Ligand binder design. Structure first.
Ligand SMILES: CCCCCCCCCCCCCC(=O)O[C@H](COC(=O)CCCCCCCCCCC)COP(=O)(O)O
Ligand SMILES: CCCCCCCCCCCO[C@@H]1O[C@H](CO)[C@@H](O[C@H]2O[C@H](CO)[C@@H](O)[C@H](O)[C@H]2O)[C@H](O)[C@H]1O
Lengths: 62, 431, 126
C-alpha cells in the first residue's frame, strides 16, 4: 500500500461547518478550568493564611 | 521589451532576449498532477517520458533540436530548443507530436519500455531521494484527499496499472487549445512565431474545455516514515501558505527569506544575518535547512525542510525554529525586513533573469495560464520595497500564530516529538 | 568583567605619556613584584580567568608549543602552592619572560565579538 494514500479520518474530522468550532470549544474549556482553578487556589491560600490570624478565644476586649 | 501576448484562437506568448544564442518554443498546459486522481496518478509523468522517448528525441536531434518537459502540480510543459534560425523547425516538430502523431509514440513497445523506465525512476526516488520524498509527503498529508496531495511523479501502485488508454483519456481531456499557451523565449521575435503558427490551420478539439473538480484544502496533520537504518532525520514542516495571485504573495516570500537557507558545511552560510543561526550552531542542531513559500492556484505551503545527524536534539532544532517564527508576529525588526527585501530581490532576479530559455519558457507559460500575463521584476521589486514590519506582523498573526501545521519526516525521527508539542510552539505565553 | 581592549586603551595612554609613564610604571613594577605570581613560576597571562568564550577562543588558537608550556607552568604552580613553598629563585619567571603571550589572541577575539554584536544590532536609516 502506497504511503501517499492516507487512511480514512472522516469519522473524526469535522465537516466544513466552521473551522473554529474545535478551537473555540477547547479554549473555553481551558479558560474556564484556568478560571476556577485560580479561584480555588486563591480560596485555599486564604484558608491557610487566615488560620494564622487571631483565634476566637484571644480577641478579649477588657 | 515588455513581453507580448497575442490571441487568434491559440494564445501565443513570447519573451525576446537579444543576448540569447538559442531559442525555445513549446506548449504549456494548465493541467498538472493536481488534475489527476489517485488512480491515474502519474499519467502526466508518463506523457513527459514518451515525449522524451528515444524515437522522438532522435527525430528532434537529427534536426538539431533538444527536448525538455516538466510535470508540475498546476501545469505541464513540452519545449523544443534550437538555434535562433531553426525556430521554424521546432514548430514543425511540436506540430507533428501534438497533431500528426499519436499511434506512433503510443505503440506497444514504446509505451511499455517507457512505463518500465518511469517505474524504476519513481522507485529510486521513493527509495533514495529523502529530502524531496519528504517534501512530497508534506503536500500529501497537508492536502490529503484533495487535488494538491498527489505526487507529481505519480505512485508505483497507479503507475503499474496504467495503460495506453489512460494516457489518451488524459490527453483528450487536458491537451486542449483552451487549456494551453504556446511559448517563445530566447532569441526569437513574436511576429516570426505568430505567423509561423498562423501559417498552418486545423483546430484539433476546438471549444472543448477541461474537466472541473473540488478545491484544495489544508489539514493540520502529519505522516511519519520512520527508518532507523538511515543516517539522518529529514523533516519538512509547514502551515497553510499563499496561493499564486494572493495579496500576500510577496509578504510570504519575504517572511521565508528572513529565516532563509543554511548549509553548516559552507563557511559563508554560517555567517548569515539570521538570528536562528545563533541558537542552532552551538550544538550543531542540523546539517542544513531551507525555508520556503510554495504557491499554487488554490493554496500554498509556508515552512521549512531540514536534515540532521543530531538525532538526540531534534526537539531543540524544531523548538528554536518555531520560536523564531513566533517573532514574525511580535518582534521582527526593521533590519531583518530590510535584509529580506534585498535577498528576495536577488532570488527573484536569479529565478527570472536566468540565462536559460527553457526556464523562461516554463515560467512564462505557467503565469500567462493563471493570470493571463506575466508580472515584471520592476513591478515585483516595487511591491517588495513597499512591505513594512507591520505587514509582516499582520501576515504572521494570520498564517503563523497559533495555527495548524503539517509535518512529514523520514529516517531517525524518534526524537521528533508528538504533534501537539510541535503545534504548541506556534505561539508563546502572554500576560 | 573589564575587557582587555579597555585595559589596553587605558594602559597604552599611560605608556605613551612621558609624564604618566614615569609616574605610574614604577608603581606597577612594584605591584607586580609584590603580587608574587612569578615566584610560583607563572606569567601574568597564565592568571587570566578562562571560563568565558573570549578566553576559550584565545586558548584554542594558542600555538601548541606555547600551550604545552602554559600547561606545565599551571601544574607546577599548583604543586608548589600545595606544598606551601615558592619555587627556587632560579626558577622564578624573569621580568623579561613575563610577556603577554596570550593578549594578542584575546584582543583579536574581543574585536571579532564586538563587531558581531554591532552587526547583530545594526539599524537601517532609510
Ligand atoms: C495544598 C493542599 C490543599 C489542597 C487540598 C485539596 C482537597 C479539596 C478541598 C480543599 C478545601 C480547602 C479550601 C476551601 O475550603 O475552599 C473552598 C473553595 O474550594 C475550592 O474552590 C476548591 C477547588 C480546589 C482548587 C485547588 C487549587 C489547588 C491548591 C493550590 C494551592 C497553591 C471554599 O472557599 P472560600 O473560603 O469560600 O473562599
Ligand atoms: C497552583 C494553582 C494555581 C492555578 C492557576 C491557573 C493558571 C492559569 C493560566 C491561565 C492562562 O495562561 C494563558 O494560557 C494560554 C493558553 O491556554 C496562553 O495562550 C497562548 O497559547 C494559546 C494557545 O496556543 C494561544 O492562542 C495564545 O495566543 C497564546 O498567547 C496565554 O498566553 C497564557 O497567558
Amino acid at each position: 500500500k502506497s504511503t501517499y494514500r492516507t487512511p480514512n479520518f472522516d469519522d473524526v474530522l469535522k465537516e466544513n461547518n466552521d473551522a473554529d468550532k474545535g478551537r473555540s470549544y477547547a479554549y473555553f474549556m481551558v479558560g474556564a478550568m484556568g478560571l476556577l482553578s485560580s479561584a480555588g487556589a486563591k480560596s485555599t491560600v486564604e484558608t491557610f493564611i487566615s488560620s494564622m490570624t487571631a483565634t476566637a478565644d484571644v480577641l478579649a476586649m477588657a | 521589451a515588455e513581453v507580448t501576448q497575442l490571441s487568434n484562437g491559440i494564445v501565443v506568448a513570447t519573451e525576446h532576449n537579444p543576448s540569447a544564442h538559442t531559442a525555445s518554443v513549446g506548449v504549456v498546459f494548465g493541467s498538472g498532477a493536481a488534475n489527476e486522481n489517485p488512480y491515474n496518478n502519474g499519467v502526466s509523468n508518463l506523457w513527459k517520458n514518451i515525449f522524451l522517448s528515444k524515437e522522438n528525441s532522435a527525430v528532434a536531434a537529427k534536426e538539431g533540436l533538444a527536448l525538455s518537459s516538466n510535470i508540475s502540480r498546476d501545469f505541464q510543459s513540452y519545449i523544443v530548443s534550437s538555434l535562433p534560425g531553426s525556430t521554424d523547425k521546432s514548430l514543425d516538430f511540436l506540430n507533428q507530436s501534438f497533431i500528426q502523431q499519436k499511434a506512433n509514440l503510443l505503440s506497444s513497445s514504446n509505451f511499455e519500455a517507457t512505463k518500465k523506465s518511469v517505474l524504476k525512476q519513481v522507485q529510486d526516488f521513493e527509495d533514495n531521494d529523502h529530502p524531496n520524498r519528504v517534501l512530497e509527503h508534506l503536500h500529501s498529508t497537508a492536502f490529503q484527499n484533495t487535488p494538491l496531495s498527489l505526487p507529481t511523479r505519480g505512485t508505483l501502485e497507479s503507475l503499474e496499472n496504467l495503460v495506453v488508454a489512460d494516457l489518451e483519456s488524459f490527453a483528450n481531456n487536458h491537451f486542449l487549445n483552451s487549456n494551453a499557451v504556446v511559448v517563445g523565449t530566447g532569441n526569437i521575435k513574436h511576429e516570426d512565431l505568430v505567423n509561423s503558427i498562423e501559417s498552418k490551420n486545423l483546430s484539433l478539439q476546438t471549444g472543448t474545455k477541461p474537466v472541473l473538480k473540488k478545491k484544495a484544502a489544508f489539514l493540520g496533520s502529519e505522516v511519519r516514515l520512520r527508518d532507523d537504518t538511515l543516517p539522518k532525520a529529514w523533516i519538512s514542516l509547514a502551515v497553510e501558505g499563499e496561493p499564486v495571485n494572493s495579496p500576500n504573495y510577496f509578504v510570504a516570500k519575504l517572511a521565508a527569506q528572513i529565516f532563509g537557507s543554511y548549509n553548516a558545511f559552507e563557511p559563508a552560510s554560517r555567517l548569515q544575518g539570521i538570528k536562528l543561526l545563533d541558537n542552532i550552531q552551538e550544538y550543531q542542531l542540523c546539517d542544513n535547512f531551507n525555508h520556503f513559500s510554495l504557491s499554487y492556484k488554490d493554496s500554498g505551503l509556508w515552512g521549512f525542510s531540514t536534515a540532521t545527524r543530531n538525532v538526540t536534539m531534534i526537539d531543540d532544532l524544531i523548538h528554536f525554529t518555531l520560536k523564531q517564527w513566533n517573532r514574525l508576529t511580535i518582534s521582527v525588526t526593521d533590519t531583518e525586513v530590510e535584509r529580506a527585501k534585498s535577498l528576495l530581490k536577488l532570488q527573484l532576479g536569479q529565478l527570472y533573469e536566468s540565462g536559460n530559455p527553457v526556464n523562461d519558457a516554463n515560467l512564462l507559460g505557467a503565469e500567462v495560464l493563471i493570470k493571463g500575463s506575466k508580472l515584471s521584476l520592476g513591478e515585483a521589486f516595487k511591491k517588495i520595497d513597499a512591505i513594512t514590519v507591520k505587514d509582516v506582523k499582520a501576515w504572521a498573526g494570520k498564517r503563523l500564530w497559533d495555527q495548524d501545521i503539517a509535518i512529514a519526516g523520514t529516517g531517525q525521527i524518534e526524537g521528533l516529538l508528538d504533534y501537539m508539542r510541535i503545534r504548541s510552539d506556534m505561539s508563546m505565553m502572554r500576560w | 568583567p573589564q575587557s582587555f581592549t579597555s585595559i589596553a586603551r587605558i594602559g597604552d595612554y599611560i605608556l605613551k605619556s612621558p609624564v604618566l609613564s614615569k609616574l605610574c610604571v614604577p608603581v606597577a613594577n612594584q605591584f607586580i613584584n609584590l603580587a608574587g605570581y612569578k615566584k610560583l613560576g607563572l606569567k601574568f597571562d597564565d592568571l587570566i580567568a578562562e571560563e568565558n568564550p573570549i578566553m576559550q577562543t584565545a586558548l584554542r588558537r594558542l600555538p601548541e608549543d606555547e600551550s604545552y608550556a602554559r600547561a606545565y607552568r599551571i601544574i607546577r604552580a599548583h604543586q608548589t602552592e600545595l606544598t606551601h613553598h615558592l619555587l627556587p629563585r632560579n626558577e622564578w619567571i624573569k621580568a623579561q619572560e613575563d610577556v603577554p603571550y596570550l593578549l594578542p589572541y584575546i584582543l583579536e577575539a574581543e574585536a571579532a565579538a564586538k563587531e558581531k554584536d554591532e552587526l547583530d544590532n545594526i539599524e537601517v536609516s532609510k
